[PDB]
Design an enzyme around this catalytic site. Structure first.
Site, PDB file in Angstrom:
ATOM      1  CB  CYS A 111      -0.947  -0.052   1.201  1.00 29.95           C
ATOM      2  SG  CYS A 111      -2.104   1.356   1.351  1.00 29.95           S
TER       3      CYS A 111
ATOM      4  CB  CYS B 140      -3.500   2.520  -0.572  1.00 36.02           C
ATOM      5  SG  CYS B 140      -3.677   0.913   0.079  1.00 36.02           S
TER       6      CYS B 140
ATOM      7  CE  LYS C 224      -6.032   3.478  -4.622  1.00 38.61           C
ATOM      8  NZ  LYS C 224      -6.924   2.279  -4.692  1.00 38.61           N
TER       9      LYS C 224
ATOM     10  CE1 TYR D 216      -7.811  -2.180  -5.547  1.00 39.40           C
ATOM     11  CE2 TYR D 216      -8.945  -4.302  -5.424  1.00 39.40           C
ATOM     12  CZ  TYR D 216      -7.939  -3.447  -4.995  1.00 39.40           C
ATOM     13  OH  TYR D 216      -7.049  -3.841  -4.018  1.00 39.40           O
TER      14      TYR D 216
ATOM     15  CD  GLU E  78      -8.547   1.884  -7.508  1.00 40.15           C
ATOM     16  OE1 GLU E  78      -7.382   1.469  -7.318  1.00 40.15           O
ATOM     17  OE2 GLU E  78      -9.375   1.993  -6.567  1.00 40.15           O
TER      18      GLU E  78
ATOM     19  CG  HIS F 166     -29.389  21.460   1.926  1.00 38.27           C
ATOM     20  ND1 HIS F 166     -29.435  20.715   0.768  1.00 38.27           N
ATOM     21  CD2 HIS F 166     -29.798  22.709   1.590  1.00 38.27           C
ATOM     22  CE1 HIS F 166     -29.827  21.488  -0.232  1.00 38.27           C
ATOM     23  NE2 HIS F 166     -30.056  22.703   0.242  1.00 38.27           N
TER      24      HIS F 166
ATOM     25  CD  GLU G  56     -28.947  17.256   1.505  1.00 44.01           C
ATOM     26  OE1 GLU G  56     -29.873  17.509   2.327  1.00 44.01           O
ATOM     27  OE2 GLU G  56     -28.368  18.154   0.830  1.00 44.01           O
TER      28      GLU G  56
HETATM   29  C1  LIG Z   1     -26.772  32.901   4.417  1.00 37.71           C
HETATM   30  C2  LIG Z   1     -27.502  31.663   4.874  1.00 37.71           C
HETATM   31  C3  LIG Z   1     -26.915  30.415   4.685  1.00 37.71           C
HETATM   32  C4  LIG Z   1     -27.567  29.247   5.083  1.00 37.71           C
HETATM   33  N1  LIG Z   1     -26.939  28.039   4.870  1.00 37.71           N
HETATM   34  C5  LIG Z   1     -27.557  26.947   5.239  1.00 37.71           C
HETATM   35  C6  LIG Z   1     -26.888  25.673   5.006  1.00 37.71           C
HETATM   36  O1  LIG Z   1     -25.774  25.520   4.488  1.00 37.71           O
HETATM   37  N2  LIG Z   1     -27.627  24.569   5.436  1.00 37.71           N
HETATM   38  C7  LIG Z   1     -28.893  24.606   6.030  1.00 37.71           C
HETATM   39  O2  LIG Z   1     -29.428  23.538   6.360  1.00 37.71           O
HETATM   40  N3  LIG Z   1     -29.502  25.810   6.249  1.00 37.71           N
HETATM   41  C8  LIG Z   1     -28.856  26.919   5.867  1.00 37.71           C
HETATM   42  N4  LIG Z   1     -29.468  28.139   6.072  1.00 37.71           N
HETATM   43  C9  LIG Z   1     -30.792  28.161   6.716  1.00 37.71           C
HETATM   44  C10 LIG Z   1     -31.930  27.868   5.745  1.00 37.71           C
HETATM   45  O3  LIG Z   1     -31.940  28.835   4.694  1.00 37.71           O
HETATM   46  C11 LIG Z   1     -33.261  27.990   6.485  1.00 37.71           C
HETATM   47  O4  LIG Z   1     -33.282  27.147   7.633  1.00 37.71           O
HETATM   48  C12 LIG Z   1     -34.479  27.693   5.613  1.00 37.71           C
HETATM   49  O5  LIG Z   1     -34.434  28.510   4.439  1.00 37.71           O
HETATM   50  C13 LIG Z   1     -35.732  27.949   6.417  1.00 37.71           C
HETATM   51  O6  LIG Z   1     -36.883  27.545   5.654  1.00 37.71           O
HETATM   52  P1  LIG Z   1     -38.311  28.123   5.998  1.00 37.71           P
HETATM   53  O7  LIG Z   1     -39.336  27.342   5.174  1.00 37.71           O
HETATM   54  O8  LIG Z   1     -38.445  28.072   7.497  1.00 37.71           O
HETATM   55  O9  LIG Z   1     -38.276  29.668   5.527  1.00 37.71           O
HETATM   56  P2  LIG Z   1     -37.807  30.405   4.201  1.00 37.71           P
HETATM   57  O10 LIG Z   1     -36.986  29.479   3.372  1.00 37.71           O
HETATM   58  O11 LIG Z   1     -37.120  31.718   4.619  1.00 37.71           O
HETATM   59  O12 LIG Z   1     -39.191  30.661   3.390  1.00 37.71           O
HETATM   60  C14 LIG Z   1     -40.199  31.574   3.872  1.00 37.71           C
HETATM   61  C15 LIG Z   1     -40.822  32.261   2.675  1.00 37.71           C
HETATM   62  O13 LIG Z   1     -42.041  32.949   3.073  1.00 37.71           O
HETATM   63  C16 LIG Z   1     -42.016  34.245   2.506  1.00 37.71           C
HETATM   64  N5  LIG Z   1     -42.953  35.102   3.235  1.00 37.71           N
HETATM   65  C17 LIG Z   1     -42.727  35.842   4.367  1.00 37.71           C
HETATM   66  N6  LIG Z   1     -43.782  36.495   4.799  1.00 37.71           N
HETATM   67  C18 LIG Z   1     -44.777  36.147   3.896  1.00 37.71           C
HETATM   68  C19 LIG Z   1     -46.137  36.502   3.793  1.00 37.71           C
HETATM   69  N7  LIG Z   1     -46.762  37.314   4.654  1.00 37.71           N
HETATM   70  N8  LIG Z   1     -46.849  35.978   2.767  1.00 37.71           N
HETATM   71  C20 LIG Z   1     -46.235  35.153   1.912  1.00 37.71           C
HETATM   72  N9  LIG Z   1     -44.959  34.756   1.903  1.00 37.71           N
HETATM   73  C21 LIG Z   1     -44.279  35.286   2.930  1.00 37.71           C
HETATM   74  C22 LIG Z   1     -40.542  34.633   2.543  1.00 37.71           C
HETATM   75  O14 LIG Z   1     -40.212  35.821   1.820  1.00 37.71           O
HETATM   76  C23 LIG Z   1     -39.944  33.324   2.005  1.00 37.71           C
HETATM   77  O15 LIG Z   1     -40.046  33.183   0.590  1.00 37.71           O
HETATM   78  C24 LIG Z   1     -28.831  29.338   5.687  1.00 37.71           C
HETATM   79  C25 LIG Z   1     -29.422  30.585   5.878  1.00 37.71           C
HETATM   80  C26 LIG Z   1     -28.769  31.748   5.479  1.00 37.71           C
HETATM   81  C27 LIG Z   1     -29.431  33.086   5.693  1.00 37.71           C
HETATM   82  C1  LIG Z   2      -2.477  -1.176  -6.934  1.00 36.07           C
HETATM   83  C2  LIG Z   2      -3.058  -1.467  -5.575  1.00 36.07           C
HETATM   84  C3  LIG Z   2      -3.929  -0.553  -4.987  1.00 36.07           C
HETATM   85  C4  LIG Z   2      -4.477  -0.794  -3.724  1.00 36.07           C
HETATM   86  N1  LIG Z   2      -5.342   0.150  -3.186  1.00 36.07           N
HETATM   87  C5  LIG Z   2      -5.848  -0.078  -1.996  1.00 36.07           C
HETATM   88  C6  LIG Z   2      -6.737   0.929  -1.421  1.00 36.07           C
HETATM   89  O1  LIG Z   2      -7.082   1.990  -1.950  1.00 36.07           O
HETATM   90  N2  LIG Z   2      -7.224   0.592  -0.157  1.00 36.07           N
HETATM   91  C7  LIG Z   2      -6.926  -0.567   0.553  1.00 36.07           C
HETATM   92  O2  LIG Z   2      -7.428  -0.712   1.673  1.00 36.07           O
HETATM   93  N3  LIG Z   2      -6.084  -1.502   0.008  1.00 36.07           N
HETATM   94  C8  LIG Z   2      -5.572  -1.255  -1.208  1.00 36.07           C
HETATM   95  N4  LIG Z   2      -4.715  -2.189  -1.765  1.00 36.07           N
HETATM   96  C9  LIG Z   2      -4.443  -3.419  -1.010  1.00 36.07           C
HETATM   97  C10 LIG Z   2      -3.362  -3.251   0.038  1.00 36.07           C
HETATM   98  O3  LIG Z   2      -2.165  -2.790  -0.587  1.00 36.07           O
HETATM   99  C11 LIG Z   2      -3.084  -4.611   0.670  1.00 36.07           C
HETATM  100  O4  LIG Z   2      -4.313  -5.200   1.083  1.00 36.07           O
HETATM  101  C12 LIG Z   2      -2.144  -4.520   1.864  1.00 36.07           C
HETATM  102  O5  LIG Z   2      -0.929  -3.894   1.441  1.00 36.07           O
HETATM  103  C13 LIG Z   2      -1.877  -5.899   2.421  1.00 36.07           C
HETATM  104  O6  LIG Z   2      -0.884  -5.801   3.456  1.00 36.07           O
HETATM  105  P1  LIG Z   2      -0.059  -7.058   3.899  1.00 36.07           P
HETATM  106  O7  LIG Z   2       0.590  -6.649   5.224  1.00 36.07           O
HETATM  107  O8  LIG Z   2      -0.924  -8.263   3.927  1.00 36.07           O
HETATM  108  O9  LIG Z   2       1.088  -7.245   2.769  1.00 36.07           O
HETATM  109  P2  LIG Z   2       2.119  -6.247   2.076  1.00 36.07           P
HETATM  110  O10 LIG Z   2       1.716  -4.834   2.333  1.00 36.07           O
HETATM  111  O11 LIG Z   2       2.194  -6.664   0.605  1.00 36.07           O
HETATM  112  O12 LIG Z   2       3.472  -6.550   2.881  1.00 36.07           O
HETATM  113  C14 LIG Z   2       4.226  -7.761   2.672  1.00 36.07           C
HETATM  114  C15 LIG Z   2       5.691  -7.392   2.657  1.00 36.07           C
HETATM  115  O13 LIG Z   2       6.503  -8.556   2.949  1.00 36.07           O
HETATM  116  C16 LIG Z   2       7.538  -8.636   1.992  1.00 36.07           C
HETATM  117  N5  LIG Z   2       7.994 -10.021   1.893  1.00 36.07           N
HETATM  118  C17 LIG Z   2       7.520 -11.002   1.059  1.00 36.07           C
HETATM  119  N6  LIG Z   2       8.119 -12.162   1.201  1.00 36.07           N
HETATM  120  C18 LIG Z   2       9.061 -11.925   2.197  1.00 36.07           C
HETATM  121  C19 LIG Z   2      10.018 -12.755   2.814  1.00 36.07           C
HETATM  122  N7  LIG Z   2      10.194 -14.044   2.506  1.00 36.07           N
HETATM  123  N8  LIG Z   2      10.801 -12.207   3.780  1.00 36.07           N
HETATM  124  C20 LIG Z   2      10.626 -10.918   4.093  1.00 36.07           C
HETATM  125  N9  LIG Z   2       9.755 -10.044   3.580  1.00 36.07           N
HETATM  126  C21 LIG Z   2       8.996 -10.612   2.631  1.00 36.07           C
HETATM  127  C22 LIG Z   2       6.945  -8.034   0.726  1.00 36.07           C
HETATM  128  O14 LIG Z   2       7.989  -7.677  -0.177  1.00 36.07           O
HETATM  129  C23 LIG Z   2       6.219  -6.829   1.336  1.00 36.07           C
HETATM  130  O15 LIG Z   2       7.089  -5.741   1.632  1.00 36.07           O
HETATM  131  C24 LIG Z   2      -4.144  -1.978  -3.043  1.00 36.07           C
HETATM  132  C25 LIG Z   2      -3.276  -2.897  -3.632  1.00 36.07           C
HETATM  133  C26 LIG Z   2      -2.730  -2.651  -4.891  1.00 36.07           C
HETATM  134  C27 LIG Z   2      -1.792  -3.658  -5.513  1.00 36.07           C
END
Ligand SMILES: Cc1cc2nc3c(=O)[nH]c(=O)nc-3n(C[C@H](O)[C@H](O)[C@H](O)COP(=O)(O)OP(=O)(O)OC[C@H]3O[C@@H](n4cnc5c(N)ncnc54)[C@H](O)[C@@H]3O)c2cc1C
Ligand SMILES: Cc1cc2nc3c(=O)[nH]c(=O)nc-3n(C[C@H](O)[C@H](O)[C@H](O)COP(=O)(O)OP(=O)(O)OC[C@H]3O[C@@H](n4cnc5c(N)ncnc54)[C@H](O)[C@@H]3O)c2cc1C
Ligand SMILES: CCCn1nnnc1NC(=O)c1cccs1
Lengths: 588, 588
Positions: A149, A154, A157, A291, A295, A566, A571
């Protein structure tokens, strides 16, 4: 029950203290060992339910029933007055280093699992050696400590995948108001490789420092188990010697396979060679459909290459096949060509690799389709990704008695024990387990704690999540849809699904209904989630958290009552409602 | 009891069919209604454990006990024989359209919750109106259907965050081998704004089309509840009339506050104006320290702005303060300046906005710090983000009897019902609830199902996950560390934590120990996870799936037994082991 546990714990621990959190005598012994730099395990009897019964059982070994009691390699050493006596007389260091074998633990293999096991064991006082050796590839490639690895898997790669993803980020940046022109920008392969190899180098060095700082002996030597406790080692100068260990952990991993055709070994390469290649592969054929194959083809196309993938039967055998086909369709629309139902017959050399000008060679590839029609085309680079295998015949004398399965992997019980009682196996060579780095790390650490600290926790290998880092990524946890239907029947399976569009894709004018997710559920078990699948950006970050909820037995109702975050892609899992049985379209 | 649920369901539903899935008389009635284009709710008594008791309860209204029982607006209509006779005599449509009021449901406000509630009610045959009106900002800004999140909230905010993130992708791309020079690339604000606004436009249009396709009447008109069932509407042409409704949902949301100082309304702007502003803000002062204030300051700095934030006391009040300080420290190292413990006294105009050539003006800001020192500096743009408030005075006649709290928000029971039995409130104006878009949507959908389809499920407002989209993002689910300690005591709280480095940051030469995560756990309850916190890229994707596991009661042991996906940021949660109490450093 308790008495069998205590005997097993006492017999295998290197240095262990039976203690109570409140006892000032135990505290005094702990302080002595810390001052002496003597590492050890500790069992705190007051914090265990059967602590009173354990204390009774200890007298079978020590003839006393009080705490503290210190043991070394199965032998009672003393209580408080006795331990202080040894320290006062400068006798304690020799006692804690008395051993029948050279090491408490020998780890053969310095990769993901082996380094994790060796470091964890040393923490509890096990005298530990880690052996690592990297057999060069046919064209001569080698690398440093850390395994597949770190060096050729790993880590490089995903770094090249990230370079490929940035191609699309540069395009999107124009739509979000930045002044660049993606049309006039190009990629320098060797600059990327230099950066990747610099990071890999820091990891090689970091593992050597970590072993040094844990008092683990690192031997850059090839190991061979010749009897239960003897490992024959061959060092860099071809000097052969023998070292002995009480416990043995086999952790030697796998290497890429080659097809048995003319020219394959001579003129093609594998993933082992790709991640340090000094020149850009150029026009490339990838043979295979794992794989690894998809990859590598994916990022080569994103970095500007002309890439073909030749597929013997299906994409991603073993994964959900609806998801596999969606993965392949995205790649084909973003510049990867596929030669389907096709295998190679021979590789012929047209041009030797040009070391003078740092340029690939040129190859003629001949093959045939399943209907017998011929394949013939020229490529600068041919990459074989047709599977990986261990070669345990080299690691392991037949006469030791370690049982292997029909594919040459080690047959183990659920505590990683082989058919030889002191020998264990972890990582890719453990038969039947998911072949992934975090599985090998968890197996190695948990095993070290059972052997040297009296732990009982086993590794849980079920429902291990995966992510395929293709140009559009694919994350999964649990059963494929077809395996669920096979196990429980179509009548007992309900599938909820939806397309989605990342918000980042709207202003960038990307595709409306390519990303996709589904939950595969069992009707008769409260709509239990059997498998989760997602195709989209950042699929591994999306999937990981749900692997906890699936481990705890999440149902569709658990997803519905959870509120989404969100705006995210993830999600969409909290509001799924269209079932496949309804026939309603999943587009949004 | 069963009998009170049935009496509430019958009284409330517009058109409802009590059924069984295996009765062909039921099936025949469904086909007639389907053919007549008559939408309705269905209750299948055979899938309910108390179905037989419901049948006896039905005889209260109908004086029969058999299946096929149709009700319209509280009145039993007929069994199979009566319903089918009405249809063949062309009498059925008149019966199901008969109503004491103009509408079964009037939604006041067409935002996140109100559009969701109105669409869901229409699915069960509720004759529904949605009212929406957007009062202009002081400088005249207005927008279309969809509410705060769509037009001036989550959607444009995260798109401008993405434009800011792309500046760092452009820098990273050089290190990964791409030939661009980030030094020579600049951002065009108006190109960004034009793309963001064209996407918002497609959403306004899509909501209009969705209401038409669900047969919801949309009125772009200002509504005022003057009695429990009468809504006064006005009217793009200022014509006043009255419409009547059985159930009323208040969903009017909030608007930005202004401080009571000279020049604020005349010369400053809010988030309401920022997302469609035709000129780049230039040298900008953001007054306030909410997530809105920090998100906007962050992307403005990333897009080339000279940005200062004026902070009255602390950052992100109500969020975990360790995490808030890490968020702000990253912002300060990446070009945001902070005037701490500081408040404004007046805004003076030095130059008028050039609407002709799309240039900001110039303002002189005077303020003071808590020690007494004076603040005085020139800025081209001043943005107020000092909280948001409802204006229910305009929406709700005091005589109706709907009780408000001391902040002017509606006091509701756990089913969103106000002190007036037919009037409900959802979204940001519902006192005490998290003010988030998916919360409004779930409240609205679930409430419509209880009113018009006999559902019983309530919205669960506990442990709702959040993400703050600052330049380095912050996701959270559950309690802050300080609230957990206050609720349970320091001795019962254990905190596991670690820094991490995204693999994408290694080749790009970004920071080693700024990304950070922690789990706040309760010792005496099996190490239950009380709160999860992560600072890093894609934090909303990381956090979402863990929210399901926390809702199901995850413990630390559940995180430990789950295996990581490698290489990801999220996998760091599966191997956390350093406690705060141990004092060991969390660095990587
Ligand atoms: C900058 C910012 C970033 C945010 N980022 C995230 C985030 O990453 N993740 C997350 O989960 N939440 C986030 N939020 C929060 C998310 O936007 C709010 O929780 C969500 O929009 C609330 O939904 P609501 O239905 O309660 O109200 P709103 O989505 O505000 O909808 C209420 C609607 O009713 C309208 N309305 C108001 N009065 C009246 C009326 N008298 N008659 C008719 N319509 C009316 C409004 O103008 C509006 O269109 C963020 C908020 C802000 C401000
Ligand atoms: C291209 C590729 C991509 C991979 N990608 C992933 C990944 O994204 N995620 C993941 O979880 N796994 C991945 N794997 C698998 C991961 O590499 C192996 O599962 C892991 O390395 C196994 O570990 P090991 O200790 O069993 O053997 P190894 O890591 O192979 O260690 C054995 C060691 O013993 C040595 N050895 C052999 N014979 C002797 C001896 N007689 N005396 C002394 N030393 C000796 C070998 O030369 C080697 O250094 C990938 C494998 C490959 C080939
Ligand atoms: C015996 C009464 C027949 N009848 N009278 N009015 N309408 C119907 N049938 C239907 O509407 C349909 C049922 C199944 C497919 S169409």
């Amino acid at each position: 029950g308790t008495s069998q546990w205590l005997r097993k714990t006492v017999d295998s621990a290197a240095v262990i203290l039976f203690s109570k959190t409140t006892c000032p005598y135990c505290k005094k012994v702990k302080d002595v060992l810390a001052e002496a730099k003597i590492k050890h395990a500790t069992i705190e009897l007051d914090q265990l339910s059967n602590g009173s019964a354990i204390q009774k059982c200890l007298a079978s070994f020590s003839k006393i029933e009080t705490v503290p009691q210190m043991f070394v390699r199965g032998k009672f050493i003393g209580d408080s007055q006795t331990v202080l006596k040894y320290y006062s007389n400068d006798e304690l260091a020799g006692i804690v280093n008395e051993s029948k074998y050279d090491y408490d633990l020998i780890v053969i293999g310095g990769g993901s699992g082996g380094l994790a096991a060796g470091k964890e064991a040393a923490k509890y006082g096990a005298k530990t050696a880690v052996l690592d050796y990297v057999e060069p590839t046919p064209i001569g490639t080698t690398w440093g400590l850390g395994g597949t690895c770190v060096n050729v898997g790993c880590i490089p790669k995903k770094l090249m995948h990230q370079a490929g993803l940035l191609s699309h980020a540069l395009e999107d940046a124009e739509h979000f108001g930045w002044s660049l022109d993606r049309s006039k920008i190009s990629h320098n392969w060797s600059t990327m490789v230099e950066g990747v190899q610099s990071h890999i180098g820091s990891l090689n060095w970091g593992y050597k420092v970590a072993l040094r700082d844990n008092q683990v002996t690192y031997l850059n030597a090839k190991g061979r188990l010749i009897s239960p406790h003897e490992v024959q080692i061959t060092d860099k100068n071809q000097k052969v010697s023998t070292i002995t260990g009480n416990k043995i952990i086999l952790a030697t991993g796998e290497r890429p396979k080659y097809p048995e055709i003319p020219g394959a070994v001579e003129y093609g390469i594998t993933s082992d060679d790709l991640f340090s290649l000094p020149y850009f592969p150029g026009k490339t054929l990838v043979i295979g459909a794992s794989y690894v194959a998809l990859e590598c083809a994916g990022f080569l196309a994103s970095l500007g290459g002309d890439v073909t993938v030749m597929v013997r039967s299906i994409l991603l055998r073993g994964f959900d096949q609806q998801m596999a086909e969606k993965v392949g369709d995205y790649m084909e629309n973003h510049g990867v060509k596929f030669a389907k139902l096709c295998v190679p017959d021979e590789i012929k050399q047209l041009k030797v690799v040009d070391t003078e000008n740092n340029k690939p060679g040129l190859l003629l590839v001949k093959g045939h389709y399943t209907d017998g029609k011929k394949f013939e085309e020229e490529f600068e680079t041919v990459i074989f990704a047709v599977g990986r295998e261990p070669q345990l015949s080299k690691v392991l004398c037949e006469t030791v008695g370690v049982k292997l399965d029909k594919n040459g992997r080690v047959v183990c019980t659920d505590d990683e024990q082989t058919t030889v009682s002191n020998v264990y196996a972890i990582g890719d060579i453990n038969a039947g387990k998911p072949q992934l780095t975090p599985v090998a790390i968890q197996a190695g650490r948990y095993l070290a704690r059972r052997l040297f600290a009296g732990a009982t926790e086993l590794t849980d290998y079920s429902n291990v999540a995966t992510t395929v880092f293709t140009p559009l990524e694919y994350g999964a946890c649990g059963l494929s849809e077809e395996d669920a239907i096979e196990k429980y029947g179509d009548k007992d399976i309900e599938v909820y699904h939806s397309n989605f569009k990342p918000l980042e894709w709207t202003v960038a004018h990307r595709e409306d209904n390519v990303c996709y997710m589904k939950l595969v559920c069992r009707k008769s078990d409260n709509m239990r989630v059997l498998g989760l699948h997602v195709l989209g950006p950042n699929a591994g970050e999306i999937t990981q958290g749900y692997a906890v909820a699936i481990k705890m037995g999440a149902t569709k109702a658990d997803f519905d009552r959870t509120i989404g975050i969100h705006p995210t892609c993830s999600e969409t899992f909290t509001t799924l409602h269209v079932t496949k049985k309804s026939g309603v379209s999943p587009i949004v």
